[PDB]
Amino acid sequence: GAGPEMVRGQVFDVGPRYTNLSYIGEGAYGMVCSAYDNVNKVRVAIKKISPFEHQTYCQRTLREIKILLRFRHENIIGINDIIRAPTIEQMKDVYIVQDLMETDLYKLLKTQHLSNDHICYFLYQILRGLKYIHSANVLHRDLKPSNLLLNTTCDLKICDFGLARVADPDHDHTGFLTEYVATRWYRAPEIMLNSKGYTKSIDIWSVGCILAEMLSNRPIFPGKHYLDQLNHILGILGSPSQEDLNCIINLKARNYLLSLPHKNKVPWNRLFPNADSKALDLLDKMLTFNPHKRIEVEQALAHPYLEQYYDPSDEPIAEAPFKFDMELDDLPKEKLKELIFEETARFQPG
Ligand X SMILES: C=CCn1nc(N)c2cc(-c3c(-c4ccccc4)nn4ccccc34)nnc21
Q: Which residues bind ligand X (CB under 6 A)?
A: 24, 32, 45-47, 96, 98-104, 146-147, 149, 159-160
Q: To the nearest whole angstrom, how small is the minimum distance from the Cβ of residue 141 to ligand X?
A: 13
State the chain's maximal CA–CA distance in angstroms.
70
> Which of 141, 50, 133, 54 is CA-nearest to residue 91?
50
Considering the complex, state which of residue 68 and residue 287 has its C-beta at the smaller distance from ligand X.
68
Considering the complex, state which of residue 83 and residue 280 has its C-beta at the smaller distance from ligand X.
83
Residue 7 annotated as part of some ligand binding site = no
Residue 27 annotated as part of some ligand binding site = yes
Q: To the nearest whole angstrom, how small is the minimum distance from the Cβ of residue 68 to ligand X?
A: 8
Sign of the C-alpha dihedral computed for residues 70, 72, 78 and 80 taken in this order: positive
Q: To the nearest whole angstrom, how small is the minimum distance from the Cβ of residue 99 to ligand X?
A: 6
Active site residue 168: no
Considering the complex, state which of residue 22 and residue 255 has its C-beta at the smaller distance from ligand X.
22
Residue 25 annotated as part of some ligand binding site = yes
Residue 223 annotated as part of some ligand binding site = no
Please check whether residue 208 is in contact with residue 227, taking contact to mean a CB–CB distance below 8 angstroms. no
Q: To the nearest whole angstrom, how small is the minimum distance from the Cβ of residue 45 to ligand X?
A: 4
Inter-CA distances, 212 with 187, 218, 334, Å: 14, 9, 43
Q: From the candidates 93, 142, 172, 203, which is the catalytic residue?
A: 142
Residue 28 annotated as part of some ligand binding site = yes
Pairing relationship of beta strands 94-99 and 42-49 according to DSSP bridges: antiparallel
Grouping H, G, I as helix, E, B as strand and the rest as coil, residue 297 is helix
Considering the complex, state which of residue 84 and residue 294 has its C-beta at the smaller distance from ligand X.
84
Note the helical H segments in the chain: 55-70, 105-111, 116-135, 189-193, 201-216, 226-237, 242-247, 251-259, 277-286, 297-302, 333-344
End-to-end CA, the chain:
24
The catalytic site residues sit at 142
- Binding positions for ATP: 24-32, 47
- Binding positions: 24-32, 47
